[model samples]
Target: MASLPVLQKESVFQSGAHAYRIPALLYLPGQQSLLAFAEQRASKKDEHAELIVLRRGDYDAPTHQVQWQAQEVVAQARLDGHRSMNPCPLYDAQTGTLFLFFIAIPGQVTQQQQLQTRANVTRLCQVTSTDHGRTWSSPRDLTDAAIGPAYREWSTFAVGPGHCLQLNDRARSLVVPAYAYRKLHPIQRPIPSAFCFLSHDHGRTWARGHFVAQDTLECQVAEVETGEQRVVTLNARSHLRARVQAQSTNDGLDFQESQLVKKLVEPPPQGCQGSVISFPSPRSPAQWLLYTHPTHSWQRADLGAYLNPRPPAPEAWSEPVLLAKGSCAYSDLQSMGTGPDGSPLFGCLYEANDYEEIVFLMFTLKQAFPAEY
Candidate 1:
């Protein structure tokens, strides 16, 4: 028998009363609060999704511990007569404002119906809170303002379904990872292309960016150091049953030709949403990308995390370190400052026990990738 790495895991939300699904995580630096977001539904189905809810975990600096608060329905995070899905949370350290972005669809209107008719009914929306998750403003419909004419060209679309990126550029621009199902020709079916919704003035105004070179699905973006300047790397689920890795030197506005990360395999039969985050090494010059996804080649089970010191290259991705075993799906990751080992700490919220529960776990880089330490 072998000893497993110690994991500080806690069951955050479980499916007993109302089902909770699709976890998204956000970490506020100065305030040191972690907001765990998910879709609170009547059932596990997408059509039954009702509202976006969150639990706030306040961090104690000296103890390196988290004190979680009760769950609350994100106020006004939805449009009337519409179902909210894909919770994307981003925080601005400068303004001390939190943005929660999501997608709204007509009640019980499944994605299949939208893609079949080639009518994009999904609405781009957002809500904000100044006092972390304690309060939130009314949802702002950004479909007309941000998406504009492109609304009619796609079958459907979705925002970060998870934690989005906040760049360190002069504007501290916010990038929301999104993908739209586009019907290039009237006779052709829709193919999803991953892109970013860029906001130079925090979350006030947003603009669309160029799509990645290949067809991609639900994605996450993070900033990486490239010796010259910082760049944003987009990791996404692709149609080829492999992960997609794209780089944007211009802070996610434009990604260079993307490549399939052949070393990272997607769960077979389709694809599952994955997460990526960038953090500086404790003893190094460059940034490393941490990725999470289900590792089973036959099915979506056994959550795995991979470390890549070199972004934009497919060859350097290390073999995954299994984080959770048996029946897991989507996941979200956050860089939780430093750990007792002087390495980057991380908090992950993920679907566990075959979608019966959503759990939050804490670990350090030294525990995850001991070889590098």
Candidate 2:
């Protein structure tokens, strides 16, 4: 397969407002057309951020029209006990429902201490749209009051026990892989470790929290099989976790002690946001694919790929594959379903030249890992 090549890169959004660390999703309603959701952070002066939706297809072709739009998912005021940032949407074609999850700070604070308090008070909420993403139902709180502390943030897609995966006994399971943060400086604590939250329903509820690792920080988990999973966390504490990827069994319900792997092409920068995706293998039944912006540092946000054995072990990874070069801005990855050609495609949101742009890259198991390598 050709080395990771860029499929399409377009500066869909432009403004004096800075945009960075974007996460996108491609929603297929069991039809020909697909919808993309991107969460963007507007400037600090801006009350609400922007969520952009577009069609996925030819890059050289004309841009697709924007669909539904929303700004500042955060609460109307800081004192109102609402924080809105990091929004991701899941589309359920079977039920024609679109569920959105985002991080919310309970109160606004200009000082670091207050920010920490607000982060601890952060909460997760869901909104459903029966008609794609054009309209959304009112927000609903999925976590019990006691599930998280005020210092919690960073939650994403987890397994679920729901109508979508009805065939599996753990259909009611959902795993949210996130991190616990402190206001300490980088020279002090350095990297933040990841945590997990499980939900039995379709994100209507959540279980208490647990650490994904004893040491690693800023982690995300992807399911290779039902209860068994692998975690790709930032090894950024002291360059020890920088080039490594951690493994966990039991559907990310618990993570084994993480070990250092290879010379990952990415940097281990402090307080940087990177994205990872774990999906079933289209080519090999027992093997799975993992795509991430393989950097521990914000300076090296290059997109990278790896193939891990289904039951992945410590240091069991194919050589790191480079898909794209690094940029000055933070980046995040999202699974954009499959392309029209049946190749699995992923979207990236990142900043360059003081603005943010959305790019798409498509790959196959054969392309990700060739026989020669």
Candidate 3:
């Protein structure tokens, strides 16, 4: 039997000065750096979010550790008394640009209020960074073009609370995981559905993709290449029993099918947001997909990591290996590629015990699934 590898964990963003919640991560292979992002909120409530902050960390090859720098505010929507929330960053290798996608909501307007009114006050916005996240361009509002006519019919929407996906295929499409709430009846509660926004021209323009599935929200996307074609997979938070899974063959333009993966359990009632990422396998040409979320079906503790070596088979997902046993909620995963030892490495930014700080955990691919190695 293969021995279990040692795991390293450290706090990346601690709750201080009344700022915390909603963690996101972006790993740049060229720079060998990791960007950690979170919403700086006045309180723990989602409506209390005021700005977005980020911290840069450079990989230390010798120590196999990420040396994080000081945290700074990267974006905010407080100009018109609007609160900025959700820091979903996508890196473009072809253009060498980092796109930060978030949502802006009017002050004093909560998601509950939007659902009650059946009208969305949220705006889709983004800011770009060209110098390895050292500097950012002015905030660009893409609500009208990206969301289009669907904004009026929706109750509210949110970009990923984690990282987004960019395809490596011919189109080089950028996919941002998002969801919207729509009311089908006047008396019934607004239904939350998962979908994506696609950008083909490097983030200059974007268009809405079809909804992945109803009763799903707060999702992350991953791309798996099979032969000459590529498939985009979406793993989402579900309101109904288990976590939702779906795939699109046409590069996330539309999902061909969606269903709940019974084995991939979720917290009871409303589920928690999870993160999914795809990386090349060290043992095979087929890609390996890793997912992180709360392990228990009834509680939001014990963040677990699940591996899927065969991307096409949902049932092929390996049983989750617990990463954190204490209180844990939202999480973001990034592939650090191969380390100095020629073994794969993964970085997980997650909420720690009591959700007081966002912690960074580093573990080798062998540690995640030792039997495979």
Candidate 4:
């Protein structure tokens, strides 16, 4: 199939002295701002992770274009003697607070080592900012208060390698999609399960949500609708060699059993992180979804975008339109208000060119699916 042409591609962070991975994009609709985040590493390996970095984008209203600023290191979003990985960011529109969540691990402790030893050394931490990405507070460790004693039952855990969700409910809960390697038995192999760390009263306090399903990992969440009832949908990468879709009716506190998304497949043997967002359909009142991941079922290549006109259904995902080309791994998506074509505008931050850099790209709903318009 002939792929959709690229609109405008800008490298948010390119690797030379240090490589960047795990792209997380967040859009502030009210502020008309975009924050692009990733992990700065000494190499492509996770163990070489250095710190979380960011780049801010200012959307010009009149020109309808984004002016991206230079990269800035999130100096406060870290723990001493530890490397921060997985740049998960969330913004509260009501309280005007920004939370950047990540896991701090000992520099040499890899995920597999944690699983093998049946111990989790990861520290769930976050830093806040009230004035967009201009400034931030010191990192706050939430491991014990958030996860409680349950952290001992898991081998390891990680939060969204991408942006999190905030429900449109009365309380407007902040949801951070996460996963843990559960060790049901001490000697048995650990299993991955997806869940969330939720904050109902903004970032002052938090609690852990129930796990979605085992074998799922590195996920993202969004607010979707089914039968006009607001629901939070979770799309995750699982060991099933396909995507896993789940529904959370209680403001993302708990999730139902996951259904295998056959249409949204994973790369060959294992799965890679993908992203999803719920956006208002320009043609309808019901919310629609935009998902971005690699299209190839055999390998991480041909990054593509799939539109789900129907919400909260695993089978409703449409065939993907190529977004980024070869060597696409982790990606994050944000729905900007409207584009030049007057459809839902989107900004994507993804690892492209084999983790050489993380790039930011923009497109309208019509640009990827012209037939609908």
TM-score of each: 0.96, 0.70, 0.95, 0.97
Give the Å error, residue 129, model 1: 1.1
Report, for every candidate in turn, its global Cα lDDT versus the true structure.
0.87, 0.45, 0.84, 0.87
Candidate 3 lDDT score at position 101: 88
Model 2: residue 250 alpha-carbon error in angstroms: 2.7
Clashes of each: 0, 31, 0, 0
Put down candidate 2 lDDT per residue, 1-373, tens digits, no spaces. 4436455554544444555334444435254333444444565232344433334432221332223232332222112356455555455444566666555554343224433343334455656766655455667765554254433442222211111111122453555555555434634432245555555565656665555444444444444553433333322222453444555545445555565554444454333444555555565333354645444344554555655554355455566676656553334444555544455545555444433455444444445565623
lDDT of 2 at 70: 29
Per-residue lDDT value at 159 in model 1? 93
Off by over 4 Å in 1: 1-4, 61-63
Query: How well does candidate 3 match the true structure, expressed as C-alpha RMSD?
Result: 2.1
Tens digit of lDDT per residue, candidate 4, span 312-331? 76777898899877888889
TM-score of 2: 0.70
Query: What is the model-wide C-alpha lDDT for candidate 1?
Result: 0.87
Per-candidate RMSD, Å: 1.5, 6.4, 2.1, 1.4
Candidate 3, residue 64: Cα displacement in angstroms equals: 1.2
**Candidate 4, residue 144: lDDT:** 85
